[PDB]
Design a protein around this ligand. Structure first.
Ligand SMILES: *[C@@H]1O[C@H](CO)[C@@H](O[C@@H]2O[C@H](CO)[C@@H](O[C@@H]3O[C@H](CO[C@H]4O[C@H](CO)[C@@H](O)[C@H](O)[C@@H]4O)[C@@H](O)[C@H](O[C@H]4O[C@H](CO)[C@@H](O)[C@H](O)[C@@H]4O[C@H]4O[C@H](CO)[C@@H](O)[C@H](O)[C@@H]4O)[C@@H]3O)[C@H](O)[C@H]2NC(C)=O)[C@H](O)[C@H]1NC(C)=O
Ligand code: NAG
Ligand code: NAG
Ligand code: CL
Length: 594
């Protein structure tokens, strides 16, 4: 039976916070070219769709009583360059200096390392910026991954107090949370429950006062292939925390490894394509609709910024697919944007207020705990460079199971769109048949070292199928009857015309990939409105006569330029193009010489 999706745009219910804008990984490798590319892709999600990168072993990037911060500087600057924040896990031994957190002097030295690093980056980036960072305890303390460090129950508590006092001495404004683990039923997860008991009821190692600061509680709960399982586990743990530790009733809860399945490197066909992408949206929709639409759930992070390894370019839990092309001179690296990363761009279009929506089948109302669901949102405009918007994101997802031999007939009924100037709608659609670079790779015979032409075909499947803007019917109503696949994503974007055109593209740079190829990366931080069709990229060889690069419509703030001719040397400039064909100002031109 067909699915009926109803959306009322006249009816703003409550805030829709973009609580999912995080990723992470575990490693220098963090400063390799591969990683610089990877982080360009992560940062290129439009409208700050990914804000934080939770990174393990950051304090192995420090060496030794004075510290050399060079490698940490390198990594944090690299994040900054892509407008990304560190999920700053205070994790590492500083090249083997720290070995024992029941050695009182080491605990004092740790406190000073932390205040020293916090002050350094307050100085380098400003207090306002570093105050946004989620400083965090050592990852998964109950999984015994400290290599050479001795971390007992008591040691962990000492370590935490050193973290807390270290950050505090740099500035009270800095935020610290933990433990970043599962919180299984006692006697399991002793350090995790032990931290809560310590912060709630224990004694500060340094000051001797009762209890210790804990600005947020971070857990890890993964789905074992079930989307709804993640939320169910979180509610059990959050309830236990609230009831056993009542001081933490309003303490924000993060699930900063909220993945469908544990084991990032385990190859899974469904991780390659829109199956994973659609499921990620489904997980988020379940959290918005079945929880936030109450415990203080504040952040959800898919831990998928890892780089993939041969022979699994697409099938690992990664935002990009890496190809190490070893038969060129020199060898080089190529990354492809996987649908999961593309989906984060679609999620980024969701605006600040949630709209009433209802999914039904044969008269039965279906909540987000079902294969078809929706998130609808609206934007209240501010200035002359802004206007009313609505974004509706519909998912069809059976979690990790793809169903290529199925169609899902949907009827979307949108109403209550208020009157506005030049109202248009734009649909963007994503599925495995049309938008899977893995799908194109398989169709090509899964070449180990794809040719330049093979990469172009693969990259042509990265973006969603976009339909040209169409004027909205009067009365603020629209009915669409798409044949969705399983998995699939469909965003309907409804935009009124802002009085002024888009802002300027900034931070444009040209990075070499290989002979005849480069990556153009830029920022959309000053473009303003989200009603963007694409970014017009222009190339000039002949002094300064500029020619647009024909390509699929894309709002991704990054583009690999690989022209058949190999002619890449010259100058480049980029601008935003809105749904009414109006351009924003061009970026400054950027030269490039091979
Ligand atoms: C082009 O040239 C580059 C060299 O520049 C080359 O890159 C190298 O590729 C290989 C993989 O093909 C990489 O080796 C893999 O590395 C990962 C990660 O290693 C780290 O972590 C492990 C522990 O987690 C440490 O032991 C290790 O020291 C590292 O710190 C490993 O996970 C891989 O091991 C698996 O694959 C091996 C075969 O490749 C198996 O022998 C091994 O048993 C492992 O298999 C198991 O785990 C799998 C997990 O996915 C699972 O699927 C299996 O079923 C099984 O359970 C492996 O060691 C190496 O790091 C790359 N080097 C660099 C510099 O990047 C490309 O391979 C080359 N291209 C071609 C086509 O040749
Ligand atoms: C810090 O480490 C880097 C990289 O290993 C090295 O180049 C640099 O000389 C070191 N700085 C100091 C002050 O020792
Ligand atoms: C989701 O649906 C299943 C039935 O498939 C049910 O057992 C489970 O309780 C539901 N969970 C939530 C949170 O709605
Ligand atoms: Cl996963």
């Amino acid at each position: 039976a067909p699915h009926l999706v109803q959306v009322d745009a006249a009816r703003a219910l409550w805030p829709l916070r973009r609580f999912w804008r995080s990723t992470g990984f575990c490693p220098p490798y963090v400063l390799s070219w591969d990683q610089q590319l990877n982080l360009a892709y992560v940062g290129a999600v439009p409208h700050r769709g990914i804000k934080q990168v939770r990174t393990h072993w950051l304090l192995e990037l420090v060496t030794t009583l004075s510290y050399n911060f060079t490698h940490l500087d390198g990594y944090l600057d690299l994040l900054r360059e892509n407008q990304l924040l560190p999920g700053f896990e205070l994790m590492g031994s500083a090249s083997g200096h720290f070995t024992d957190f029941e050695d009182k002097q080491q605990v004092f030295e740790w406190k000073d390392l932390v205040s020293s690093l916090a002050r350094r980056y307050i100085g380098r980036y400003g207090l306002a910026h570093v105050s946004k960072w989620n400083f965090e305890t050592w990852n998964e303390p109950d999984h015994h991954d400290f290599d050479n460090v001795s971390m007992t129950m008591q040691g962990f508590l000492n370590y935490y107090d050193a973290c807390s006092e270290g950050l505090r001495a740099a500035s009270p404004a800095l935020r610290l949370g933990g433990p970043g683990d599962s919180f299984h039923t006692p006697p399991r997860s002793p350090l995790s429950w032990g931290l809560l008991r310590h912060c709630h009821d224990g004694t500060n190692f340094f000051t001797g006062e009762a209890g210790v600061r804990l600005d947020y509680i971070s857990l890890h709960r993964k789905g074992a292939r079930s989307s709804i399982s993640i939320l169910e586990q979180e509610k059990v743990v959050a309830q236990q925390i609230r009831q056993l530790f009542p001081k933490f009733a309003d303490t924000p809860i993060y699930n900063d490894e909220a993945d469908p399945l544990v084991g990032w490197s385990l190859p899974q066909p469904w991780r390659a394509d829109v199956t994973y992408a659609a499921m990620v949206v489904k997980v988020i929709a379940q959290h918005q609709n079945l929880l936030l639409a109450a415990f203080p759930y504040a952040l959800l992070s898919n831990d998928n910024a890892f780089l993939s390894y041969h022979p699994h370019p697409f099938a690992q839990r990664t935002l990009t697919a890496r190809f190490q092309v070893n038969n060129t001179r020199p060898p080089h690296v190529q990354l492809l944007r996987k649908p999961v990363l593309t989906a984060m761009g679609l999620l980024a279009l969701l605006d600040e207020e949630q709209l009433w929506a209802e999914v039904s089948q044969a008269g039965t109302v279906l909540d987000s705990n079902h294969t078809v669901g929706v998130l609808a949102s609206a934007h209240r405009p501010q200035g002359p460079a802004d206007a009313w918007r609505a974004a509706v994101l519909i998912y069809a997802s059976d979690d990790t199971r793809a169903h290529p031999n199925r169609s899902v007939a949907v009827t979307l009924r949108l109403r209550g769109v208020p009157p506005g100037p030049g109202l248009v709608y734009v649909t963007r659609y994503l599925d495995n048949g049309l938008c899977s670079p893995d799908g194109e790779w398989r169709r090509l015979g899964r070449p180990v070292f794809p040719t330049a032409e093979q990469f172009r075909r693969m990259r042509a499947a990265e973006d969603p199928v976009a339909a040209a803007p169409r004027p909205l019917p009067a009365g603020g109503r629209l009915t669409l009857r798409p044949a969705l696949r399983l998995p699939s994503l469909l965003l309907v974007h409804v935009c009124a015309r802002p009085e002024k055109p888009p802002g300027q593209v900034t931070r444009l740079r040209a990075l070499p990939l290989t002979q005849g190829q480069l990556v153009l990366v830029w920022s959309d931080e000053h473009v303003g409105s989200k009603c963007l069709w694409t970014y017009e990229i222009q190339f000039s060889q002949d002094g300064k006569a500029y020619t647009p690069v024909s390509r699929k419509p894309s709002t991704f703030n990054l583009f690999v330029f690989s022209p058949d001719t190999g002619a890449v040397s010259g100058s480049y400039r980029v601008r935003a193009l809105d749904y009414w064909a109006r351009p924003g100002p061009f970026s400054d031109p950027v030269p490039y010489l091979e």
